[PDB]
């Protein structure tokens, strides 16, 4: 509903939450269809949730063994940096991916003592904590990002935007000061009129 309200109807969401264009785009489309880091991180977050719920579905339908299910969640939570692609919109989540790769090393050599190198491991509880804590820290972040976006959709953006100075416009603003000070000290010493 967000994509269709923005006017974008050539962007398709598949049901596994990938956003793909339906056609080759003019540049006026590519400037219009830039979705920010809020939407995509929200889309990658639902994709992770859809990815976990569907494995519990395929166990529930009888298609998946109970030990395959526990390996399934253990495969997901170790490889969210491989299955989703949430890392590009917040690279800070690479800390959690290092956490889920480190716990994976800690669990395996405890688990895979004396039984080879199979894919059977399904002790998904520690890596489950890491994404559950990361979801704790990015509730308030995403509430702010998407709260700004929808109020920008429903109200437009502000007319009163004032540009703070940065590195690029430093010498330009130093000019506008220097013009105005010389304007004042000469317009005060003129005769009159």
């Amino acid at each position: 509903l967000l994509i269709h309200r923005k006017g974008l109807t050539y962007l398709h969401l598949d049901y596994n939450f990938n956003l793909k264009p339906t056609k080759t785009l003019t540049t006026k489309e590519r400037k219009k269809s830039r979705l920010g880091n809020s939407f995509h991180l929200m889309r990658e977050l639902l994709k992770m949730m859809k990815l976990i719920v569907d494995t519990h579905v395929q166990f529930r339908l009888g298609n998946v063994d109970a030990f395959q299910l526990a390996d399934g969640i253990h495969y997901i939570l170790n490889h969210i940096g491989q299955l989703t692609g949430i890392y590009r919109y917040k690279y800070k989540v690479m800390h959690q991916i290092r956490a889920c790769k480190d716990l994976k090393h800690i669990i395996y050599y405890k688990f895979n003592k004396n039984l080879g190198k199979g894919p059977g491991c399904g002790f998904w509880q520690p890596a489950w904590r890491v994404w559950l804590n990361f979801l704790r820290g990015t509730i308030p972040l995403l509430e702010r990002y998407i709260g700004n976006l929808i109020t920008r959709q429903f109200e437009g953006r502000s007319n009163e935007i004032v540009k703070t100075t940065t590195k690029q416009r430093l010498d330009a603003y130093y000019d506008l000061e220097l013009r105005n000070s010389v304007m004042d000290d000469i317009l005060e010493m003129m005769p009159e009129s």
Binding site: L1, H4, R5, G7, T9, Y10, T22
Partner: protein, 261 residues
């Protein structure tokens, strides 16, 4: 009474028989927020209404009559109301008793309950303005209504005089052949608002014509709000009735000061 109060209102269209909510496809993908079609061009978008009001047939008591509802059913006028006698709004031609109830209310909103706006729409279509008590409709687009039958110029007015006479008391009906359009003025504004939605996208065919099977293929006529009447034979009638309206208000207004003192 005998035609209206005696019976109850009848279901015009079955709820399965109602049209689909999506419009006809004039684009490549459907848009979900705005319920329209997006890519490519935009074609026409006007079609003949499949449904029409038979006023002496479909009128009757409804649920809004016992509740004291003030407003008329919008889809009674289009011939589309699927609730029948279970509908909250009224299902009959507006009468002097009915517009007397709407008298405090008609000033800002129509007989259908939709709010009037400040100025008119650009094509004089839609609901209307509260700034002008317009009682005259511009009956236009008559060629697409008639399915491009010629007929004559005065027979077209005969179709207009028969259809709009069922929708209320009429001040006058004027047809202009060179402009191929009619001007129907009503006694009340509420009839004019009622007949506007009743006769939008309709056809003046009368099934005694051979195109009656192809009434759907046409375009459908435009009933819109009329502009002022530019001939001074009508302009002098405007300020004459505005004078009589002012004299009828001053008698009522000095009695307010009589009671105020």
């Amino acid at each position: 009474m005998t035609s209206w109060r005696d019976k109850s209102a009848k279901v015009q269209v079955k709820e399965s028989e109602l049209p689909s909510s999506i419009p006809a496809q004039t684009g490549l993908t459907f848009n979900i927020w705005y319920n329209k079609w997006s890519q490519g061009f935009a074609g026409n978008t006007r079609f003949v209404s499949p449904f029409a009001l038979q006023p002496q047939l479909h009128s009757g008591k409804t649920r809004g009559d016992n509740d004291g509802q003030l407003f008329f059913c919008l889809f009674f006028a289009k011939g589309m109301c699927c609730l029948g006698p279970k509908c909250e709004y009224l299902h009959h031609i507006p009468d002097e008793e009915d517009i007397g109830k709407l008298a405090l209310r008609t000033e800002v909103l129509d007989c259908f309950g939709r709010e009037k706006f400040a100025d008119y729409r650009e094509d004089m279509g839609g609901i209307g303005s509260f700034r002008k008590k317009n009682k005259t409709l511009y009956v236009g687009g008559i060629d697409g209504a008639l399915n491009s039958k010629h007929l004559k110029p005065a027979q077209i007015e005969s179709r207009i005089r028969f259809v709009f006479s069922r929708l209320g008391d009429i001040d006058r009906i004027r047809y202009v052949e060179s402009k191929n359009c009619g001007f129907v003025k009503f006694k009340y504004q509420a009839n004019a608002e009622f007949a506007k939605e009743a006769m939008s996208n309709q056809t003046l065919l009368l099934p005694s014509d051979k195109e009656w099977d192809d009434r759907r293929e046409g375009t459908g006529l435009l009933v819109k709000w009329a502009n002022e009447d530019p001939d001074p034979a009508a302009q002098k009638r405007l300020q004459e009735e505005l004078k009589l309206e002012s004299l009828n208000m001053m008698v009522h207004l000095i009695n307010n000061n009589t009671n105020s003192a």
